mmCIF file of C-alpha atoms in Angstrom:
data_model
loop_
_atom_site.group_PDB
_atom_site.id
_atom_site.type_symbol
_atom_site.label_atom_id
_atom_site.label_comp_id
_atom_site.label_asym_id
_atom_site.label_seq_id
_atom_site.Cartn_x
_atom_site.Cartn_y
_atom_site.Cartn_z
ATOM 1 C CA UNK N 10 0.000 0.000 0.000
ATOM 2 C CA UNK N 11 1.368 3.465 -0.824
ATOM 3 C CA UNK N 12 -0.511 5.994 2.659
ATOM 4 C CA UNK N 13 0.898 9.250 4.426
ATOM 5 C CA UNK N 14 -0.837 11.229 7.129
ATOM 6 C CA UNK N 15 0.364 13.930 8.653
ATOM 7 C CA UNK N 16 -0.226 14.691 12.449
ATOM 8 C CA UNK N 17 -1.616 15.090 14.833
ATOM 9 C CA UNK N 18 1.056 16.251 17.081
ATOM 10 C CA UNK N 19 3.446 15.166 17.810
ATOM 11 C CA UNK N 20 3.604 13.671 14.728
ATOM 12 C CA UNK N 21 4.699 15.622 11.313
ATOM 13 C CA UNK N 22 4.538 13.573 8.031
ATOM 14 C CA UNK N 23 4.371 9.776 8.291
ATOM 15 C CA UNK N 24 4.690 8.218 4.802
ATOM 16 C CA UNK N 25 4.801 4.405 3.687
ATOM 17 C CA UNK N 26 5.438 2.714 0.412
ATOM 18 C CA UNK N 27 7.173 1.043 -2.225
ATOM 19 C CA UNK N 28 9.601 2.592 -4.329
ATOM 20 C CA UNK N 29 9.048 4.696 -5.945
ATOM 21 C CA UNK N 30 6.829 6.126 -3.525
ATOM 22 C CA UNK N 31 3.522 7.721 -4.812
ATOM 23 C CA UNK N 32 3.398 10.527 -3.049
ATOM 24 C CA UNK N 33 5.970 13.042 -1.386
ATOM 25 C CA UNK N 34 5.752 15.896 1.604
ATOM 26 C CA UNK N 35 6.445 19.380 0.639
ATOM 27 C CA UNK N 36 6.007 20.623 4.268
ATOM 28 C CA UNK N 37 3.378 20.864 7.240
ATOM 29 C CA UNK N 38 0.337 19.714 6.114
ATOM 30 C CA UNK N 39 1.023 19.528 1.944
ATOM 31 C CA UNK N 40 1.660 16.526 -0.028
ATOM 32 C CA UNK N 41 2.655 16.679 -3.680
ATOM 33 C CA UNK N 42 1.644 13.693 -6.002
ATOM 34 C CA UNK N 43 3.640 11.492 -7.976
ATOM 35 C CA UNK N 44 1.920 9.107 -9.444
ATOM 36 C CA UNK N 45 -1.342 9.255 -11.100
ATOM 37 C CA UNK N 46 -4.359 7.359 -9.554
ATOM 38 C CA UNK N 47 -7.810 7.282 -7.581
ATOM 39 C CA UNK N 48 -6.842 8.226 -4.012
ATOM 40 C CA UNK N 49 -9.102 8.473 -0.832
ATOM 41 C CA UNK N 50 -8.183 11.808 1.409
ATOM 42 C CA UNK N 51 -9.202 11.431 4.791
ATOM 43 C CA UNK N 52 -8.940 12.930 8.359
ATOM 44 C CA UNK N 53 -10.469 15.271 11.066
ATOM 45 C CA UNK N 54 -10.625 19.100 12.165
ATOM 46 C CA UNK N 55 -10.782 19.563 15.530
ATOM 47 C CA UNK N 56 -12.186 22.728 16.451
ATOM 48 C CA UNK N 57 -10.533 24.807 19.585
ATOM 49 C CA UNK N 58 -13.841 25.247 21.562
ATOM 50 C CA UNK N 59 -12.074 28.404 23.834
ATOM 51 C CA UNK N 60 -11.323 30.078 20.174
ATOM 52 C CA UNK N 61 -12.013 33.533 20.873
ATOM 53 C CA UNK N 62 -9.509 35.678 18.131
ATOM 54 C CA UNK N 63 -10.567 38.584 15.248
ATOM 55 C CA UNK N 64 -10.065 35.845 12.564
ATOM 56 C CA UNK N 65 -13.317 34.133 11.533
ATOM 57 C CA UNK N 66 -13.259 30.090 11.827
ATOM 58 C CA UNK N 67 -12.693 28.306 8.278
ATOM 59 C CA UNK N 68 -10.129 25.456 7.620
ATOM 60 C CA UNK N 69 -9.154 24.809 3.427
ATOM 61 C CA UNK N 70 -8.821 22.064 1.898
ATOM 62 C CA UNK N 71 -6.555 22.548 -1.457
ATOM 63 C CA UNK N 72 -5.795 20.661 -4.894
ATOM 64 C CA UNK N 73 -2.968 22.785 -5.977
ATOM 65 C CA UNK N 74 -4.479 26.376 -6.416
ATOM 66 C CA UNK N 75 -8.171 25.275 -6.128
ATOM 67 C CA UNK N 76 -10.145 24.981 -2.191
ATOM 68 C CA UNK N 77 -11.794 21.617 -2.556
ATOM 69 C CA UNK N 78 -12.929 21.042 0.906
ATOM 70 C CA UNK N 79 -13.972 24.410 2.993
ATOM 71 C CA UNK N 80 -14.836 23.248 6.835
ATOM 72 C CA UNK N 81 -16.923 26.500 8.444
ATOM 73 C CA UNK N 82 -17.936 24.766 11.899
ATOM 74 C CA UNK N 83 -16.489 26.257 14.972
ATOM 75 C CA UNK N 84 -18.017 23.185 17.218
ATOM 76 C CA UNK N 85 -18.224 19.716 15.700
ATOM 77 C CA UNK N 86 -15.375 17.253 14.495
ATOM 78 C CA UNK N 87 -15.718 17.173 10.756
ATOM 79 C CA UNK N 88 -14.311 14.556 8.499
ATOM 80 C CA UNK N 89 -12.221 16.054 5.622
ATOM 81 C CA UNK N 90 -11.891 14.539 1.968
ATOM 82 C CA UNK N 91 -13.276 12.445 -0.053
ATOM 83 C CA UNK N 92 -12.429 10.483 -2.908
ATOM 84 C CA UNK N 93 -10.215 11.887 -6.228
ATOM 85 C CA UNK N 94 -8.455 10.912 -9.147
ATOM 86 C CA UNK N 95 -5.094 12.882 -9.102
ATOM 87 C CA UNK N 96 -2.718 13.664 -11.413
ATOM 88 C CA UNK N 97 1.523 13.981 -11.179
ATOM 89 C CA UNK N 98 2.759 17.720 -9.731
ATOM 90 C CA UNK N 99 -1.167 17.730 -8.139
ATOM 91 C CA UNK N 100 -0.694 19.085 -4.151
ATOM 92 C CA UNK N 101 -3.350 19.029 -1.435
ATOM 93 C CA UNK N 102 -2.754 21.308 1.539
ATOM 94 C CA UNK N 103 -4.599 22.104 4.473
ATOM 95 C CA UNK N 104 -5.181 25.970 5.610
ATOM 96 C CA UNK N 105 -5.824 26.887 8.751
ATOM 97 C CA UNK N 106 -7.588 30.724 9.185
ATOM 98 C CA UNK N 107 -5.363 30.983 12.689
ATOM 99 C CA UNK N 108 -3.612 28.051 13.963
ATOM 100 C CA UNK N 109 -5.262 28.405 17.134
ATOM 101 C CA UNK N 110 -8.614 27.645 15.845
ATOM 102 C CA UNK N 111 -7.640 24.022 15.942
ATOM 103 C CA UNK N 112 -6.661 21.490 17.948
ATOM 104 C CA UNK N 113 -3.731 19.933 16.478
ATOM 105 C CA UNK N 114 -3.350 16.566 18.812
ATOM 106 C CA UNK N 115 -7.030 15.972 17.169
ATOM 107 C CA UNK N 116 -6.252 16.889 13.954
ATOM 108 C CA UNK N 117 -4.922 15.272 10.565
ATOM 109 C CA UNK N 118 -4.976 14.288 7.073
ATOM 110 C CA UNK N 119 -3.807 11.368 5.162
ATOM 111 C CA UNK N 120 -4.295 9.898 1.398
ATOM 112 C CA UNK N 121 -4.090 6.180 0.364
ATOM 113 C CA UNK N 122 -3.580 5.113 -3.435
ATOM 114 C CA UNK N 123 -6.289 3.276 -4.242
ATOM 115 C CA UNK N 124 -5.907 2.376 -7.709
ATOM 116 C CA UNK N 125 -4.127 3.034 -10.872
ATOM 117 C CA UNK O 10 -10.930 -8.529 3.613
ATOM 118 C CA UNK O 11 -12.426 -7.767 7.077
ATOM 119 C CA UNK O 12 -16.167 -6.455 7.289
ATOM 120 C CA UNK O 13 -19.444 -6.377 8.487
ATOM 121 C CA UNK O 14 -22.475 -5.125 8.202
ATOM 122 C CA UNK O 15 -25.903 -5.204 10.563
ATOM 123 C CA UNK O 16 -29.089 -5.831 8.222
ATOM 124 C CA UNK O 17 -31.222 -5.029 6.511
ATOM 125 C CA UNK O 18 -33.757 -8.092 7.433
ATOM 126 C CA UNK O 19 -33.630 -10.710 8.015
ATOM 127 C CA UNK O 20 -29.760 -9.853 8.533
ATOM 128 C CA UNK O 21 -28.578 -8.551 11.555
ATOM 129 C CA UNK O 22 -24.554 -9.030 11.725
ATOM 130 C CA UNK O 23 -22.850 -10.553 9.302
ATOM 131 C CA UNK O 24 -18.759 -10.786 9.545
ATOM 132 C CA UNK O 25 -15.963 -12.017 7.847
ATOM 133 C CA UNK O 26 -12.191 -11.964 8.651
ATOM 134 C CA UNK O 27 -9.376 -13.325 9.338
ATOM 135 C CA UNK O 28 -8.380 -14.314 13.258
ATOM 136 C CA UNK O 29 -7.750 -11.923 15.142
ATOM 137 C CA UNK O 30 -10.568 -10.029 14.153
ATOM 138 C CA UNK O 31 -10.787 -6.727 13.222
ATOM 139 C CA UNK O 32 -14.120 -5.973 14.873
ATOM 140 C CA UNK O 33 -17.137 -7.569 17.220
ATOM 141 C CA UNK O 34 -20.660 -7.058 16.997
ATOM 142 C CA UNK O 35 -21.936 -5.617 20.505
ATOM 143 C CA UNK O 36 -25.526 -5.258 20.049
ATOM 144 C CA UNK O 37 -28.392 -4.623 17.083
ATOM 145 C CA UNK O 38 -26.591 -1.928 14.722
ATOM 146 C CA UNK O 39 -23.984 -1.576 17.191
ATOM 147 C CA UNK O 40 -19.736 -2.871 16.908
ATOM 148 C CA UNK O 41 -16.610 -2.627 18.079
ATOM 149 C CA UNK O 42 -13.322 -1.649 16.624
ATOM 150 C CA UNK O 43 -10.746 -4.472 17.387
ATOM 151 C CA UNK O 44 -7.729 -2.943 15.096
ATOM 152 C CA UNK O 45 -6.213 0.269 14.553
ATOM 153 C CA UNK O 46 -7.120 1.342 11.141
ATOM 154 C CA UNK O 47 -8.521 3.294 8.365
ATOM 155 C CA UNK O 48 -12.133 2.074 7.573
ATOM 156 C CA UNK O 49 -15.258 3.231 5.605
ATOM 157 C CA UNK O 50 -18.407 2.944 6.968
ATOM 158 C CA UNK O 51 -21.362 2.779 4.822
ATOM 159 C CA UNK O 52 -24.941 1.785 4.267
ATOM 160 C CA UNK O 53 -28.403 3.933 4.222
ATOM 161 C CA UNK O 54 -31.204 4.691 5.587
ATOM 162 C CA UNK O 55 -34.612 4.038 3.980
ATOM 163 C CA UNK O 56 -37.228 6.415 5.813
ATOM 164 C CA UNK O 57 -40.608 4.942 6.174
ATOM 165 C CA UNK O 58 -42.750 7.300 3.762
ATOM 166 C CA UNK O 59 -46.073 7.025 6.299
ATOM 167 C CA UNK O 60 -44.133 7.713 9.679
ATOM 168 C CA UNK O 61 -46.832 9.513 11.289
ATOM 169 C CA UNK O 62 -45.745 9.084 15.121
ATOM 170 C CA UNK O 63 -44.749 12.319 17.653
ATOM 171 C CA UNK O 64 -41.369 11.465 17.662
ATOM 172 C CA UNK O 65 -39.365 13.751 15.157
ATOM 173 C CA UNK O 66 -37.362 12.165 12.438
ATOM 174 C CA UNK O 67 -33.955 11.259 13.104
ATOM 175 C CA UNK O 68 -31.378 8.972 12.418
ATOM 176 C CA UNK O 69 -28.085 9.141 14.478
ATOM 177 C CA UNK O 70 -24.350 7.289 13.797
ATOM 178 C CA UNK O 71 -22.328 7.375 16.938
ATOM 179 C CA UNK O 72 -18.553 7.044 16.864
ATOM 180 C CA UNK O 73 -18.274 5.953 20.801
ATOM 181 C CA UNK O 74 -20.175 8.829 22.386
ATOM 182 C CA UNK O 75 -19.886 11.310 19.567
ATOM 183 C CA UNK O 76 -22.529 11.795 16.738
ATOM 184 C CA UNK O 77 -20.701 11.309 13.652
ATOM 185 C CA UNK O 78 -23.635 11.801 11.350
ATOM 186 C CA UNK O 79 -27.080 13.217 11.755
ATOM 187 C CA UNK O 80 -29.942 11.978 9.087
ATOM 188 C CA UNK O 81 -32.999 14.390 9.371
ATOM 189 C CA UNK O 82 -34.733 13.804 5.612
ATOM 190 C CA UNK O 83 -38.061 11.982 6.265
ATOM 191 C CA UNK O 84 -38.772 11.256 2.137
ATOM 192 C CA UNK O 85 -35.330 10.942 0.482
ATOM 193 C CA UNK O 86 -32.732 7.465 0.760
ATOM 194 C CA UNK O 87 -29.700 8.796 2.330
ATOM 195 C CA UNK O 88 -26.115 7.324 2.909
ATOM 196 C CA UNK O 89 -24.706 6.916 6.087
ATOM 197 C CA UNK O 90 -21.193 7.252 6.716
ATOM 198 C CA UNK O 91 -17.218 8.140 4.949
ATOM 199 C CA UNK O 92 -13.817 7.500 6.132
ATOM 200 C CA UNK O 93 -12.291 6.770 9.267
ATOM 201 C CA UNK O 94 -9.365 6.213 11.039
ATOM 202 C CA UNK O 95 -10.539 4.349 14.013
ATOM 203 C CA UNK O 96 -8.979 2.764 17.193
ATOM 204 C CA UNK O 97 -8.987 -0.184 19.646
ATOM 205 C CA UNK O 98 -11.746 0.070 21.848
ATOM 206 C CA UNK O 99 -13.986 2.698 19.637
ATOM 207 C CA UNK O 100 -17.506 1.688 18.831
ATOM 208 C CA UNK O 101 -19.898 2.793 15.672
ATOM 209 C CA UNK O 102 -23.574 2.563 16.533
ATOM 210 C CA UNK O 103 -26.712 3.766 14.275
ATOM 211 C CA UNK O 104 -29.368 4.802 16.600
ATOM 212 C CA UNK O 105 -33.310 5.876 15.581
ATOM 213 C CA UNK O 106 -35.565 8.417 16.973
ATOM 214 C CA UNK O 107 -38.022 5.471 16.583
ATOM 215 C CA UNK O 108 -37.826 2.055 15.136
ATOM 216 C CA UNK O 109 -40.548 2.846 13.005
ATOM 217 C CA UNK O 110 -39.468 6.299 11.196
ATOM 218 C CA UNK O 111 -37.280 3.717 8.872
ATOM 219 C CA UNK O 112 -37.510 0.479 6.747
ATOM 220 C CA UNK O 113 -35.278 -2.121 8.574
ATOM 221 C CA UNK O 114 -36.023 -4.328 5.148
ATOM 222 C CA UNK O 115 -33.961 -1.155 3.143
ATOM 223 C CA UNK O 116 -31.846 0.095 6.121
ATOM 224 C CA UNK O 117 -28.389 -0.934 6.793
ATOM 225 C CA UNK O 118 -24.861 -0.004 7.670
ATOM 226 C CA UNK O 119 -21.291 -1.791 7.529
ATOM 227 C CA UNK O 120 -17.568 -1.483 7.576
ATOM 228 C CA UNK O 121 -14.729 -2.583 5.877
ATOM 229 C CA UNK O 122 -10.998 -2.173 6.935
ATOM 230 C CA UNK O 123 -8.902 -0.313 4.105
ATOM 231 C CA UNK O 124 -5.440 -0.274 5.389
ATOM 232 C CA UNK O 125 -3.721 -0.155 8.375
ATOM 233 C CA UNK Y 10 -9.469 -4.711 -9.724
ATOM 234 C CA UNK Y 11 -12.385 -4.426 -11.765
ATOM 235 C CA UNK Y 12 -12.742 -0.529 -12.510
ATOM 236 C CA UNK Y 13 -14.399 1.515 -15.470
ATOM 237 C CA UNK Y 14 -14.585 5.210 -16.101
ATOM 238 C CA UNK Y 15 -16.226 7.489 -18.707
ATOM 239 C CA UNK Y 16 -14.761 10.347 -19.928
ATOM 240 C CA UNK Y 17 -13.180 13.169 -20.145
ATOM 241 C CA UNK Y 18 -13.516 14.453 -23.809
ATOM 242 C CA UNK Y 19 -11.368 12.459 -25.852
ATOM 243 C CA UNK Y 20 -12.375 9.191 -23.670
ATOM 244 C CA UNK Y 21 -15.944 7.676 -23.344
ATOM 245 C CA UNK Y 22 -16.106 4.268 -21.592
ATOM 246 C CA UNK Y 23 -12.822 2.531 -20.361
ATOM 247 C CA UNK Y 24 -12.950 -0.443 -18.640
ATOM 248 C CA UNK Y 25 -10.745 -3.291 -16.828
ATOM 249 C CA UNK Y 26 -11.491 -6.403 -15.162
ATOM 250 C CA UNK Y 27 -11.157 -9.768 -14.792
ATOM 251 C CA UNK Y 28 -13.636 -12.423 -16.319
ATOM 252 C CA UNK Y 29 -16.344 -12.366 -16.098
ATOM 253 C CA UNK Y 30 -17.005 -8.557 -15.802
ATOM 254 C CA UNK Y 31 -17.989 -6.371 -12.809
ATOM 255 C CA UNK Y 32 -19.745 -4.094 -14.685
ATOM 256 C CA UNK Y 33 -20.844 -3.408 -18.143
ATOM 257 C CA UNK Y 34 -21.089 -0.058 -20.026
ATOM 258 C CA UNK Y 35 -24.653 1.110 -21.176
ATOM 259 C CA UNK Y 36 -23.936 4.092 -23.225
ATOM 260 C CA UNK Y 37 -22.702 7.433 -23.099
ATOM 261 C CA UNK Y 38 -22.344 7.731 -19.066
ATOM 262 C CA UNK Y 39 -24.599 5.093 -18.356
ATOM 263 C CA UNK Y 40 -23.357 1.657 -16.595
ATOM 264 C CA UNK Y 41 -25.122 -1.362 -15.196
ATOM 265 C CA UNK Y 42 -23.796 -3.374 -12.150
ATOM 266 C CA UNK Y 43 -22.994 -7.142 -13.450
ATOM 267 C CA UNK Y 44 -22.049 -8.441 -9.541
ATOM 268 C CA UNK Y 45 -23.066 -7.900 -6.064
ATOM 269 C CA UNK Y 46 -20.561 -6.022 -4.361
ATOM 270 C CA UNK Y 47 -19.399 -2.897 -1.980
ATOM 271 C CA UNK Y 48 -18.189 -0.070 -4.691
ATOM 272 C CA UNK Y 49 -17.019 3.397 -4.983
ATOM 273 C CA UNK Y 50 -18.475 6.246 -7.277
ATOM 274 C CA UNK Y 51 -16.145 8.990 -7.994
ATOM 275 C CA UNK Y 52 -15.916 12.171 -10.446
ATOM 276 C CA UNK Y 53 -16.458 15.427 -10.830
ATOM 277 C CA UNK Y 54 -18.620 18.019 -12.426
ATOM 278 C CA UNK Y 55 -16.921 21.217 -14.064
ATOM 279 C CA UNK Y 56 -19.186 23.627 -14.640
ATOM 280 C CA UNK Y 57 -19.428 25.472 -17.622
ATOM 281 C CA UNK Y 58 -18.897 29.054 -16.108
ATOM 282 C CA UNK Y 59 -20.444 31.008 -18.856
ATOM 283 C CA UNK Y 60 -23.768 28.892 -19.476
ATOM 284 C CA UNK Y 61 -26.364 30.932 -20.417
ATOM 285 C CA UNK Y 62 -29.041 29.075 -21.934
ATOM 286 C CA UNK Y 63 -32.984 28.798 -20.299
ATOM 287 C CA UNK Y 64 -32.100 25.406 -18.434
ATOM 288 C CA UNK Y 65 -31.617 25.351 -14.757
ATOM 289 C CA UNK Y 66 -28.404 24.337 -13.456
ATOM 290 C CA UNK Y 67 -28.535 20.744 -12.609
ATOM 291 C CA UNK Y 68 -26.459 17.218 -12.959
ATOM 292 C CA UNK Y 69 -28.395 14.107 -11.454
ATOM 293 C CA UNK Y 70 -26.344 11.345 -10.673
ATOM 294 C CA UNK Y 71 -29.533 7.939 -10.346
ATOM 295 C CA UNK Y 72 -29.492 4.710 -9.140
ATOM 296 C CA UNK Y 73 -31.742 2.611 -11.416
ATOM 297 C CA UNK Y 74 -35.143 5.302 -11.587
ATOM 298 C CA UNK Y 75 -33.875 7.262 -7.894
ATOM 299 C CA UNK Y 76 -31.638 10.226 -7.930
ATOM 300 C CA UNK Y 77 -28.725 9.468 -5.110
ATOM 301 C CA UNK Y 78 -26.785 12.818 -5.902
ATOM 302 C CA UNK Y 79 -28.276 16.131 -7.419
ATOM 303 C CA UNK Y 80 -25.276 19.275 -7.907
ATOM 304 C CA UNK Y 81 -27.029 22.528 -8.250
ATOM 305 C CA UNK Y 82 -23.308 24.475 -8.264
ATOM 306 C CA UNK Y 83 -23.038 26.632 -11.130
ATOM 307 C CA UNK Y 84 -19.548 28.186 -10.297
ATOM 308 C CA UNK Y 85 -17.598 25.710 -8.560
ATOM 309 C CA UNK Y 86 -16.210 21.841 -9.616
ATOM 310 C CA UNK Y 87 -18.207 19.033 -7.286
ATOM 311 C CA UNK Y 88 -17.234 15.704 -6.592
ATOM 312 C CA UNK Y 89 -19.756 12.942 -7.658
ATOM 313 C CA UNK Y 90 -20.378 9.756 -5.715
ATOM 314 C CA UNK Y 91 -19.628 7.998 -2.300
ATOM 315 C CA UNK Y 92 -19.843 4.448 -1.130
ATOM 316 C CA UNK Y 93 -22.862 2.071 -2.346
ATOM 317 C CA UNK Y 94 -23.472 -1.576 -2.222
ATOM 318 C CA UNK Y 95 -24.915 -2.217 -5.482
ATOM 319 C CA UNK Y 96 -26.532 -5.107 -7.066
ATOM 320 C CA UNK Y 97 -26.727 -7.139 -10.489
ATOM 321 C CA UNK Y 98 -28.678 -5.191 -12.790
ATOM 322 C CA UNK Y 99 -28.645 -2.134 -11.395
ATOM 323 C CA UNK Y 100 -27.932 0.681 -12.886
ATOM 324 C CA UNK Y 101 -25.757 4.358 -12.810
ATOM 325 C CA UNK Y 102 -26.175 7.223 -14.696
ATOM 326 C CA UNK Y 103 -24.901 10.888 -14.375
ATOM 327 C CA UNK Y 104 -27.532 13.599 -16.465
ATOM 328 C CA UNK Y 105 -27.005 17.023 -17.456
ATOM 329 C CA UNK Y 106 -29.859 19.155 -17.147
ATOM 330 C CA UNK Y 107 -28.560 20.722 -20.918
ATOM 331 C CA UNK Y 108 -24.804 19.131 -22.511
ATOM 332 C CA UNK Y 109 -23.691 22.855 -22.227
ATOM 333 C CA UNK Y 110 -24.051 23.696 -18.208
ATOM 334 C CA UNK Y 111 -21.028 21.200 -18.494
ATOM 335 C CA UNK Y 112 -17.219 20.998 -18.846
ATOM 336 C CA UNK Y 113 -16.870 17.695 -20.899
ATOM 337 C CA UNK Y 114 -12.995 17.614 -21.458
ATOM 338 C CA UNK Y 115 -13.414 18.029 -17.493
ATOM 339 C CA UNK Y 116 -15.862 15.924 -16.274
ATOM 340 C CA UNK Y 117 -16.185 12.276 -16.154
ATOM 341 C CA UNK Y 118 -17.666 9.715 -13.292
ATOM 342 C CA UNK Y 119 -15.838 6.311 -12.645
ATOM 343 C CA UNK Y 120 -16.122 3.154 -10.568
ATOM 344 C CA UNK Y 121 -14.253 0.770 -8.363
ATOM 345 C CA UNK Y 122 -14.966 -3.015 -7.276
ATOM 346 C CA UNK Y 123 -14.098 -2.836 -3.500
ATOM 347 C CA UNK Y 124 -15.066 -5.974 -2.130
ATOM 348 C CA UNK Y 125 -17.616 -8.640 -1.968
#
């Protein structure tokens, strides 16, 4: 299986797979892709319930320039993801509006390759 | 493959894996997660067109004590479910406002284990 | 694996599977489900940003007669699909409310066998 998740704390990026792998980290929270295929993103944002700054609460989700995913709910754990066929050079990145509106030893992302 | 899935009738759970398993049935509509994991949970429910009791309509999915999912359309088939990376100990239940606000011969959920 | 996709523009249906078949193509978009089994619907819809013709917006993805996904998003590219067990002899089929409201060299709807 080719898989990579990053967090939550105190973990960073985790990856696993053959060579060559199918996907690689470009930093925190962004993952470029490098092979073509149907993947499955998956993972949770947990929402700092004591969030009280000037920014309003959204968390991105992003394929390469594009949001995909836009998470708007300042109580609830909500799943982020779904399923996509991506291409080689494709990223996905996760935004945070403050990274304080968060809590990031409840939150993460991963990808598996599920096909080619 | 592990999996199982709880109805619709005459069903209630049905499993197959290897040993150890990767979950146990605990009650009607209601399991345990055996293995660390990332699993998708699916299914639907079927809302019974004439429900004409006080109760209002509602269809819950629990991950342990935690609504996951929250089905509120009395006319339309809905999924129930996505992806999730679950843990030892965790349990998935599908809980009704009333037995009778659904069609247990059309309603159904179940789980498979993608990768660990 | 036992997959199929149609499109994008230049591609209609592809397939791949073992024999015998999982699936078989219809037509144009249209698939019917040759064995019982737990599969995933994927895609996208790219809107056609400057449609301007009398139509509503709307793509309807059905299951047999039933409509399991309606996108009513006029601006922004949606996935199609989720998780369904599906039957033998059932059918999918993704409709455009006019062939125009559409992005066909960047839309396209696939499938994958996941288990029995």
């Amino acid at each position: 299986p080719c898989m990579a998740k990053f967090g939550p704390l105190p973990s960073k990026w985790q990856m696993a797979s053959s060579e060559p792998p199918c996907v690689n980290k470009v930093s925190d929270w962004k993952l470029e892709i490098l092979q073509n295929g149907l993947y499955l993103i998956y993972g949770q944002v947990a929402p700092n319930a004591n969030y009280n700054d000037v920014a309003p609460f959204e968390v991105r989700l992003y394929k390469n320039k594009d949001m995909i995913q836009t998470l708007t709910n300042k109580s609830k754990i909500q799943n982020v993801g779904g399923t996509y066929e991506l291409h080689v050079g494709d990223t996905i990145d996760l935004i945070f509006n403050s990274e304080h509106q968060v809590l990031k030893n409840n939150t993460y992302w991963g990808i598996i390759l599920l096909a080619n």
